[PDB]
Design a protein around this ligand. Structure first.
Ligand SMILES: NC(=O)c1ccc[n+]([C@@H]2O[C@H](COP(=O)([O-])OP(=O)(O)OC[C@H]3O[C@@H](n4cnc5c(N)ncnc54)[C@H](O)[C@@H]3O)[C@@H](O)[C@H]2O)c1
Ligand SMILES: NC(=O)c1ccc[n+]([C@@H]2O[C@H](COP(=O)([O-])OP(=O)(O)OC[C@H]3O[C@@H](n4cnc5c(N)ncnc54)[C@H](O)[C@@H]3O)[C@@H](O)[C@H]2O)c1
Ligand SMILES: NC(=O)c1ccc[n+]([C@@H]2O[C@H](COP(=O)([O-])OP(=O)(O)OC[C@H]3O[C@@H](n4cnc5c(N)ncnc54)[C@H](O)[C@@H]3O)[C@@H](O)[C@H]2O)c1
Ligand SMILES: NC(=O)c1ccc[n+]([C@@H]2O[C@H](COP(=O)([O-])OP(=O)(O)OC[C@H]3O[C@@H](n4cnc5c(N)ncnc54)[C@H](O)[C@@H]3O)[C@@H](O)[C@H]2O)c1
Ligand SMILES: CCNC(=O)C(=O)O
Ligand SMILES: CCNC(=O)C(=O)O
Ligand SMILES: CCNC(=O)C(=O)O
Ligand SMILES: CCNC(=O)C(=O)O
Lengths: 335, 326, 326, 335
């Protein structure tokens, strides 16, 4: 009855601070905050927690987000170097690490980001046992495997951002060619995210009309329309953005926001994300690559068995062998 | 081997543990107004509908499900048995007969609460119950005593809608969006609602500061008719259209959002006010409460002035004497 | 001096040039289902309602305006005179009697179009007209000839809703969200709709690839009953609830979004198909069109197979012979 | 009948490329793209055009946004150094320039950003004559004046982002103190954006309850609750974010997104933005400061006459004199 808060507000219950739709982002770099602002403007999280080892930059990014509290609906934004703020997250998004491509890349950086996951995954899983881990850092297909091993979590709950973006890039350029919104051009990229992704031209379609129906040479070099160069631009428009601005952040953030929605809302949408493919498309080793997956509140609940044709399945398996030896290429350093 | 078997390899058994479920009880005008508003704001992972009119309930539910491709709610269910309402975070009660705040009809809707509230709480023990049916301040009290739940988790839609009307009419008079015109209606949802001209303001400027007879009959601008309209707009609508659906659906959707997202926003909703403004009995009336994931976590203590407190305490007793008649 | 005069200094005269206005004609079940769906997706700066039922029209409009504080549309207006519909970018026609695709009732709704479409186009010369009333493929043609507008700017809601049902039922059978199950219904909105099992697919996998008798009576899985349901779901709903409102409102809101935001998405909507699939006369039927800020800017040329083309051309003639009867 | 597009799509009309809700952002730095991603995830624009003089960074930021096309609804994203892409914008957002505070700041940077506006405003106004210009670059109250003079546009159509963010910061910290969502704490900052802003404690309230009603010493030093230090933190939490992360981007972007919504949707909401205040609160010179303004499709249609008390009006007028001489401090360099 002396202070303003006491005079104006009668507390009836002690407020809960155990959110029930909570998101932690680990790594508040370009990709991390792109994820953050996108998750915030779509109101996909009750509480958003941020983790990083740059204690100063982490505190600054969090305050900047907080000062926008009036303009979105996430009611609690927190941060800290100790993973206790991670506690009881529905989804933990891992964005930490150096910037690099996949497949053909220097092991020093591949191993550096592997070291980062060894540091964080044990804690992340301790404080959020029932969470799904959504791996974004690159090489994404390899770190998702690494995380899954360290975490000891079910394979269904450890997911790589994979080719969700690749397919979005794919659908954007198809749309430009045809003059149609990407939401209406349908086309799938699978396998490795980045340099050696596999386009499945058999399925590229509009309104159910296979495009290779209209152009039997779609995706071959013989094609006089040069549709295959779309796939090469899918791959290299990424490289080009890095050249021109130095990194990629905006589209991946939207891609993560796409996946986070499907998981939390339990939509059971199909997305090309990285899951473990042993026992699928003739794969007999334990490795992670992108295939079409049904995504729900429990992570990957089902997967789609696209019947790959001989050319597609060959590249898929080649890429699978690539990652396999690189997964083997970290084990031999961790003697 | 089926298409599904050949197309889709099951990896885990999909859960029916909806982490953000909502049930609406009574799929009438107000019920499905709430339903569609909740659906287009993606505030629920699962939406369950319950009614005694089996045929209407199934038609409503199917009509909603056919629109699944245009919203994000993944599961819509219906049923006369309250098992389908299990594990809702919020149950919105809109069942009843169209009414106001004669007693034959008040008991008619009290009969309904006595038969639904037990099964509702049984299947969703941690839920919040948002009472919309009228008399809302009465039935919220009835529902609370039936449920045996904490007082902070039974909430009447109350004067959220009253205040939304109050601000719309203040906005038209001033030429400003209702969001930027602030004003409060508390007490009864209905004919004895209490306007707080004390705090009616734009940009922090108390309006009565600029016209000190604001809200009196003396007033030359006659702002007190905006309150008369707050009350008579509802009656007018009911004469012209037959009922009220859209605004109250929106008001419910507003409250549901503060609760589920635990925003801790202040809304004028019906809670039990024993201990405030010299209220000595157990009755529910709208006052400014802080809404979060547990319902009312805090209430605001507005120091009602000479005349405001009078009608609030009158508004209060009107109800208390309607309640005691069993 | 008033509160407004003392509070607010006018700097310019506020314009009534709504740059994103929408009119709904016919504030019935379907009319106001469209209305609330448009309002909660913030697709219109101004929403205008027109009807012959003055009293209902004013009650509906007021009930919407009282919710102004919960959505972003700044102005809601009504009126029996079509002047209030002036300068809409889209006019959605939902007026008429509940019907199907007897002729006494078809002429009944044609009587309506003849009396509204002239005033509509007069006041909104650059608008798109989205026809929802049934028979939709018929009335879209009627409206087009009355309006004198380009064919690309008169559009029937058509089989957007049909296809949304098609995908919902394919999704329940497979356990996948309707957005990820792709399938197309074209031709008549109603009983003679044509399913294109050719292109029904998930993740690009043609479903008939996995079960080559997909969509036949021979089929052991009996997928052809999902199409029967697409048609009979509507009838079922009408028997149980009395009418259909929510899904079609959502489908209209989907189309309105592609148009206003000029997204160039492909929807199966009713356009005039003279020249395609050997259609020789002027009739409207649903096929995949690209929707943008001018309505239909492009149409997709699906090479209908042996049997599909047959029923589409049959579906087509059914209508042409209903039209010629004045 | 040979190519896929010809075979699959029959063009009936030539597609329009004259958007009718278009936004140009000038300056694709931290603030510019924060604005961009926020405008995109709220679907406030049919078309979004980007302008900058860093041709490479501009091209990269635009492609990155484009690759997310599948996840939002803005159907055309464009960029270019030539202001023809600005053409027929409803709103042009100016985010270009060096980073600096207001009032007490080095003239070399104030003049540098003044030079930038001289370069762009003539073109911007040539290609979008009926547009509103929303000025974000700092010092914001001075550049908004500068822009308005150069543009020759009506005063109602040239708006500074001003204290919309300041008030959001203000409402966020009030909310923390009281444990209430900022949307429900109401409190206004006006005048200079940044170092010398004026808090109006007379109006700070919850549910219509003035807080100084409950604490007559609210906002004085004598206050045992030290509510005034909230205002000092409003001011210096900005400084602190710059120290910790190097700049501010996220909250201002959300603040601009707030204002863009009110303008395009013609909401007629009241926001504290910078308009020209000559003839208001005793001001007799031509200068720009933030007061509560009604914002609609035509810019500032009305303004609110808060009756400032003697202490408030004194600081408002002092700050007004500050900007006045600095507006005079650029004229004497532009001999
Ligand atoms: N999957 C995709 O499609 C995709 C797309 C773009 C980028 N990425 C990638 O993911 C990463 C992010 O790129 P950025 O541009 O955001 O990087 P960035 O340099 O901007 O910073 C990311 C953060 O990682 C943090 N970090 C390092 N060790 C940590 C630890 N032990 N705990 C917590 N945080 C730690 C750093 O402090 C740093 O702030 C890169 O590997 C990049 O290649 C992937
Ligand atoms: N608080 C407010 O601001 C506000 C505003 C408007 C209306 N309302 C009111 O709330 C209610 C809704 O009115 P309506 O317009 O929806 O009426 P309505 O007749 O259209 O439908 C209400 C439904 O309740 C159902 N019902 C009755 N007993 C039931 C039971 N035991 N279990 C399940 N369902 C049952 C009926 O089958 C009916 O469909 C009325 O009491 C009305 O006065 C309140
Ligand atoms: N295309 C589809 O997918 C689809 C789906 C469902 C229903 N519909 C249909 O569209 C219409 C809507 O049905 P409802 O359920 O809305 O019926 P309803 O009776 O509830 O209301 C329709 C309104 O039209 C009005 N009206 C009649 N003549 C008018 C005129 N000259 N000017 C203005 N208003 C006029 C009436 O006053 C009435 O309120 C029906 O024809 C129905 O069959 C189409
Ligand atoms: N009003 C507020 O509340 C507020 C808040 C934060 C920052 N800001 C400010 O606004 C600016 C943006 O800060 P940043 O962090 O985004 O800067 P930044 O360094 O990230 O880059 C902004 C862009 O300005 C561009 N530019 C320079 N000359 C140009 C010209 N002639 N035409 C087009 N573009 C040109 C540059 O190329 C640069 O990319 C700074 O002045 C900063 O202080 C204001
Ligand atoms: C740097 C690795 N990431 C990419 O190449 C991408 O943006 O897809
Ligand atoms: C049934 C009574 N309802 C009302 O008065 C209202 O809609 O506010
Ligand atoms: C009035 C007929 N309507 C329908 O069949 C439908 O709703 O699809
Ligand atoms: C650098 C100038 N801008 C600020 O201080 C702010 O973020 O308000």
């Amino acid at each position: 009855a002396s202070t303003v808060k006491e005079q104006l507000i009668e507390k009836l219950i002690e407020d809960d601070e155990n959110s029930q739709c909570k998101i932690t982002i680990v790594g508040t770099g370009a990709v991390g905050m792109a994820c953050a602002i996108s998750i915030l403007l779509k109101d996909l999280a009750d509480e958003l927690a941020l983790v990083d080892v740059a204690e100063d930059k982490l505190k600054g990014e969090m305050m900047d987000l907080q000062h926008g509290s009036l303009f979105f609906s996430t009611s609690k934004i927190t941060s800290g170097k100790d993973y206790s703020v991670s506690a009881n997250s529905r989804i933990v998004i891992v964005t930490a690490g150096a910037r690099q491509q996949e497949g053909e890349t220097r092991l020093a950086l591949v191993q550096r980001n592997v070291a980062i996951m060894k540091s964080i995954i044990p804690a992340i899983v301790h404080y959020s046992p029932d969470c799904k881990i959504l791996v974004v850092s690159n090489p994404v297909d390899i770190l998702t495997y690494i995380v899954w091993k360290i975490s000891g979590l079910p394979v269904t709950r450890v997911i790589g951002s994979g080719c969700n973006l690749d397919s979005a890039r794919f659908r954007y350029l198809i749309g430009e060619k045809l003059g149609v919104h990407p939401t209406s051009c349908h086309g799938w990229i699978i396998g490795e995210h980045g340099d050696s992704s596999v386009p499945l031209w058999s399925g590229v379609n509009v309104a159910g009309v296979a495009l290779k129906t209209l152009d039997p040479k779609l995706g071959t070099d013989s094609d006089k329309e040069h549709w295959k160069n779309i796939h090469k631009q899918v791959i290299q428009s990424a490289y080009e953005i890095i050249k021109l601005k130095g990194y990629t952040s905006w589209a991946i953030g939207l891609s993560v926001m796409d996946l986070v929605g499907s998981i939390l809302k339990n939509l059971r949408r199909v997305h090309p994300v990285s899951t473990m493919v042993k026992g699928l498309y003739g794969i007999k080793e334990e490795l992670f690559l992108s295939i079409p997956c049904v995504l729900g509140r429990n992570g990957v609940s089902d997967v789609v068995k696209i019947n790959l044709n001989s050319e597609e399945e060959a590249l898929f398996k080649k890429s699978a062998e690539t990652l396999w030896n690189i997964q083997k290429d970290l084990q031999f350093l961790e003697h």
